[PDB]
Symmetry: C3
Subunit: 455 residues, 3 copies
């Protein structure tokens, strides 16, 4: 009544109008397919960080990726989507108008080429990828119940505000003119500096794997590293290629850039390791460099000329390779790989987007930008820096607050203090905890949860 297209609410009355008439069907199919591709990045993250670990984590990140898929999907439905995309928000956050996805259907989303329900599906996968990056960064000696509560809180007050600034209709970074093609701020920079907060507050200090003359690479499972890198590179075609919101050839241009950045990242990191080790070929390094290039190109893929995409592989791979060495200077391992690849890599890619963004690349599908230094729009570089500094500041500070507030509450503390922690070898010889005898997550039906040596 008349139920015709409103652009608001559900978008119109399905008994009176065909809400699909507002959208190009092929735009919708590509973003639906891209959503399925982003979903498999979630176990990709878990396999990557399970395999790279120089310590045997009690919690298996391949399994924890499914936990994170569950918690993130519930959080997004409950209020995460609304806090980012309620079409009635301020410049810093949305509202609860779409609580429990009420009225999320056929109105054109902030990306006008797809309806709200499809943009909800797609952008929910980005929230889930960020959740498993965060669970991966903070997984060492984590308690599972507190970890799930932590992810729910962290998505609500760290991810959703930064996403709003980046993508929301009134978000202040959008208005400023900062460029972030595929969510490098909300996913990579954000999770990387949240990882850093974990590292400096809850990570183990003077860690035996980061202390003295110890190997930079000493992986738990190379096959897990490679399988994770496979799922991540495969899924990144949806992550970057879908960030146009349409079926135009800017989507395929973005995919070419993504593949070439991954390829030149992997080769660059391996070559850097070859110089730095005196002639060894680093299995871990090739995979880390592919990830550095994928992270590097994320803010840029739909904005930069194809030949510059090799720079988004080369330069993040070099800078991140040396960032990992900071684990030695701090003597801290926990959380630091996620910070090195996603935090440093995300900062570097965002910065370089202000150099190489081109108005004629964006205009492949009609997208209008001032451009970067390629267009002599010199001010663009400061817009990038303002966004990166704001994301890093908010993620680091608020994550720190959550971690330290939970640490003060005994049943929410995410990581026990060691003097509180009964060893699994001793739990096993108690009958109530005999299942700790099996310390191999491939056969144990139960998570080897940290237990307070107070019962």
């Amino acid at each position: 009544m008349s139920g015709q297209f409103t652009g608001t609410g559900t978008g119109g009355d399905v008994f009176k109008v065909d809400l699909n008439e507002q959208f190009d069907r092929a735009d919708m199919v590509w973003i639906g397919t891209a959503s399925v591709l982003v979903w498999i990045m979630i176990p990709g993250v878990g396999l990557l960080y399970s395999g790279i670990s120089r310590k045997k984590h009690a919690l298996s990140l391949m399994w924890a990726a499914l936990m994170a898929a569950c918690v993130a999907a519930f959080q997004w439905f409950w209020w995460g989507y609304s806090l980012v995309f309620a079409h009635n928000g301020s410049v810093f956050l949305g509202t609860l108008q779409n609580f429990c996805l009420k009225d999320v259907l056929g109105a054109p989303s902030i990306v006008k080429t797809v309806p709200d329900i499809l943009f909800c599906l797609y952008q929910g996968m980005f929230a889930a990828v960020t959740a498993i990056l965060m669970a991966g960064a903070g997984c060492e000696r984590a308690r599972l119940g507190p970890m799930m509560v932590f992810l729910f809180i962290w998505l609500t007050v760290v991810y959703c505000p930064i996403a709003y600034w980046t993508w929301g209709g009134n978000g202040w970074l959008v208005s400023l003119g900062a460029l972030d093609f595929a969510g490098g701020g909300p996913v990579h920079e954000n999770s990387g500096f949240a990882a850093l907060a974990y590292s400096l507050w809850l990570g183990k200090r003077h860690d035996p794997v980061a202390k003295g003359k110890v190997p930079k690479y000493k992986p738990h499972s190379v096959s897990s590293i490679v399988m994770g890198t496979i799922f991540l590179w495969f899924g990144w075609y949806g992550f970057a290629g879908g960030s146009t919101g349409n079926s135009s050839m800017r989507s395929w241009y973005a995919c070419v850039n993504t593949n070439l950045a991954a390829a030149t990242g992997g080769l660059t990191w391996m070559l850097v390791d070859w110089f730095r080790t005196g002639g060894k070929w680093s299995t871990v390094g090739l995979c880390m460099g592919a990830i550095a290039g994928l992270v590097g190109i994320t803010p840029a893929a739909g904005y930069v000329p194809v030949y510059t995409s090799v720079i988004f592989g080369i330069v993040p791979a070099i800078i991140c390779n040396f960032a990992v060495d900071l684990k030695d200077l701090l003597q801290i391992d926990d959380g630091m790989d996620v910070w090195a690849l996603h935090g440093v890599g995300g900062f570097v890619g965002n910065f370089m987007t202000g150099l190489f963004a081109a108005d004629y690349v964006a205009m492949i599908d009609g997208t209008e930008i001032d451009g970067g230094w390629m267009n002599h729009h010199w001010k663009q570089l400061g817009y990038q820096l303002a966004g990166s500094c704001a994301v890093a500041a908010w993620s680091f500070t608020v994550t720190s607050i959550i971690l330290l507030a939970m640490d003060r509450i005994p049943f929410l503390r995410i990581r026990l203090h060691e003097d509180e922690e009964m060893l699994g070898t001793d739990l096993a010889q108690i009958g109530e905890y005999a299942y700790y005898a099996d310390d191999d997550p491939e056969t144990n039906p139960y998570v080897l949860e940290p237990i307070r040596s107070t019962t």
Copy 2:
């Protein structure tokens, strides 16, 4: 001659007309993509049931999934497609009009938005998923040759009639008005009660893993469980999202519902295990609950409001978690996990579809239904029950007949009697059977087939 569009046979003469003009190209692309996604559910099933097993099966279900992909694809081409979709069928079964896919091309299928050749591709994947569920349920001490003959027969006289009732142009459940969005009857309820027939006739009785005080969860391979659950959740976007037959936003609505049902299923099952074990976190339980929610939402995903999708996770996860305990009461393990998740989960989801189905959800793409209790269409619940009872009755009874008839034929008996079965340790010390020395399917080039201790 004139070769114009007939709606029958091949659909028209390709030298005179463009058969593609009848269809929206984006509808076709989504259903083609959805078909590829359903295909990877096939190894998903195999990995899931290989990993969950409390017994070391001689036949590897990850490998047997490829066997099932082969046998199902051949059966579907030979006559399975025709028995379901020959456009000239009765109310209980189709015909042999499309034997060896004769004349399967460009006529609009029973789903009018895609042509016959594409609907054949898509629906053939559902048959294959059901084949590996059945091979998984009956895999313990199976003989491979008899198993392949069994699957061919079972698809023909169990799957294809139930599929016809559910999807065929004249199928009686269609006419009755029963709702089954994505094939929960033909795939899940059907395979689950066929599994039950296996369990009660050919499964081992007084089984040491189900007898006395034994662990409910004792998995063969947690990594296989998790990888299977990954492929299943990823592929389920095609399974449910493609069941609209089109590129409309009802497809994406169905995907949101599927993801939220999986997410709330996984968390619910894990929480139930946490209460029931006194505080342990169940690795197996999280994955089983995701599957219970995916099964639960299958008949409902394109029919129910988004906020009700959490109920299709919560309630199947609870009921299935207690259904698994029935393995203790019966002291039978073999076949029972497939019955618990797909049979019980499929029944519960189908039942709840009669409660929560809504005419305004179906109408997102113009689909016309009376609705469920959400529309005060109280009679809908009895239509659901009639379908579930008919599927369970046919699958249980006819599977029982096939299994017991094959058991009476020495060269077709699917599972040897134990008193007929030479132990692999003794075969190994015979020179003709020395390859039984390697009882690990990761390195053995040969299936460790059960051998009659009569040669």
Copy 3:
């Protein structure tokens, strides 16, 4: 200026025209999705050939697949795409007009339904699949630096000319009328006869695994075989289904043919092994037969009637199964599995395409061909043979030249002579090479590179 559609160069001025208006959006979405699917075939190849190996390769092919993805993507961007698709080529090779993908954007590609940038993405995946087939065939005792230089050279002077003959605007096989639906010449025949050149020049002679009474199947990892076969069959829907360049139902017809050829290949090979071993069921054989059928149907999938697709499974599976026995006659293992499946299988499929190709199958999307023996176009068979003989001759001869020229240059030699090769057990007891103590690529951070026993 006027910047309107030119059909050349970038295709027009993005500030004046919408280059996307030239293309059906759903055609573009399917080819973008198909590109992502071909990408996962790359690790598919690596897992397959890592798992089938009867020798423990020091270089892990699952990891080397990512290396090959990197080197192939760079080579394609640098000049590989231009050497195949520069719209200004001769009848044997392209040019450097699109060096570093200059001007590759919105002009219609040689496949007029997609733009250059998308055809570049798609066809680059075929180059990468061929790169990992070649790295797999030559992986035994390979040195990694020389291998990467070899792949770059081999793509440039073996792959790119054969691809040009097959797909280029003026390619001589195109003009002759040879049929090759999905690149069976450039990918399978080419890599298979390049593998053969490796086998006969650099492979080990009188090899203990191929000499005397030794098992035909003795795999390194059955799970790797199965996972590789999963990724290959899943990805082949993009490989074959995308080779129409469009969203028509010829794409879905091609997928039905691909699935049925894989299915009948797998069953046929397993049955042949069952007869030939006296009743054993071959795990490796089922997977090899699926690959033989996938290779067999590649030149044919969009050209032959559905019922003939079973012949593209049966006949390649039989001929390839006996081709593998040639490893016994030669007493050579290295490289020969890639030749047997891709070289022999590719030749057989190409040959049979001249028998079974049908003008009424091609015309499903308007494609015009004379047809094969199904249309009494008897000359078609000689066109197939001319292409297969030219591909095999060029690939074998030029690969031989590259391998033997690199062998003469000490720092480029791909495989050390054994008398040059220090054993890993002795390297380990040197302090500079102690990391050779860990000969298991699952935990070693470094490739176990062959070292000259001269330092």
